Curated annotation (Swiss-Prot):
Name assigned to this protein: Bcl-2-like protein 1
UniProt keyword terms in alphabetical order: Apoptosis, Cytoplasm, Cytoplasmic vesicle, Cytoskeleton, Endocytosis, Membrane, Mitochondrion, Mitochondrion inner membrane, Mitochondrion outer membrane, Nucleus, Phosphoprotein, Synapse, Transmembrane, Transmembrane helix, Ubl conjugation
Molecular function via GO: BH3 domain binding; channel activity; identical protein binding; protein kinase binding
Record organism: Homo sapiens
Quaternary structure and interacting proteins, as annotated: Homodimer. Interacts with BCL2L11. Interacts with BAD. Interacts with PGAM5. Interacts with HEBP2. Interacts with p53/TP53 and BBC3; interaction with BBC3 disrupts the interaction with p53/TP53. Interacts with ATP5F1A and ATP5F1B; the interactions mediate the association of isoform Bcl-X(L) with the mitochondrial membrane ATP synthase F(1)F(0) ATP synthase. Interacts with VDAC1. Interacts with BCL2L11 (via BH3). Interacts with RNF183. Interacts with GIMAP3/IAN4 and GIMAP5/IAN5.
Family: Belongs to the Bcl-2 family.
Effect of mutating G93E: No heterodimerization with BAX
The record's note on its domains: The BH4 motif is required for anti-apoptotic activity. The BH1 and BH2 motifs are required for both heterodimerization with other Bcl-2 family members and for repression of cell death. The loop between motifs BH4 and BH3 is required for the interaction with NLRP1.
GO CC term, one of those recorded: nuclear membrane
Length: 142
């Protein structure tokens, strides 16, 4: 029952990041805007780490899930917090841009699904217990 809303948040963020990197293909608005702003701030703060990610990934359709699962499990190893959720969205965004750059566009819809499933199954309980997305908007939005 949460599947569609979590999918909408993931697709809004990924569409935004792909557009920001030059690819125009293929309140809920307050949450989407706060996440876009948080993702931008995160990328500007950790630009070096994105460069290290884009140079060590060697993304292929066969390894993309293994890479996704490895990084996401490491990110949340010590538990969840809002900063790690922002890193999770940012990582997904970076993986999608890298997939399109390497002519592996087929991975974009796959990564969106892996992100929505992880948000649904592992992050949603923490999100609700820590004030919901309205709390996130207060801490990261405007
Ligand atoms: C020696 N270590 C000292 C401390 N650091 C590791 C622990 C903190 N970093 C992470 O957990 C982390 C982040 C991340 C998380 C938040 C901020 C910055 C980086 C990302 C990440 C990469 C790309 C994008 Cl786009 C987004 C996130 C991946 N990881 C885990 C994979 C990494 O190889 C470590 O195991 C650096 C090396």
């Amino acid at each position: 029952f949460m599947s569609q809303s979590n999918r909408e948040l993931v697709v809004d963020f990924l569409s935004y990041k792909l557009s920001q990197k030059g690819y125009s293909w293929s309140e809920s608005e307050a949450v989407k805007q706060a996440l876009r702003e948080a993702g931008d701030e995160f990328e500007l703060r950790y630009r070096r780490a994105f460069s290290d990610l884009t140079s060590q990934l060697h993304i292929t359709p066969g390894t993309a899930y293994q890479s996704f699962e490895q990084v996401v499990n490491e990110l949340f190893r010590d538990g969840v917090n809002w900063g790690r959720i922002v890193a999770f969205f940012s990582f997904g965004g970076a993986l999608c841009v890298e997939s399109v750059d390497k002519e592996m566009q087929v991975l974009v819809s796959r990564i969106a699904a892996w992100m929505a499933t992880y948000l649904n199954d592992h992050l949603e309980p923490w999100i609700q217990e820590n004030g919901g997305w309205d709390t996130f908007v207060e801490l990261y939005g405007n």
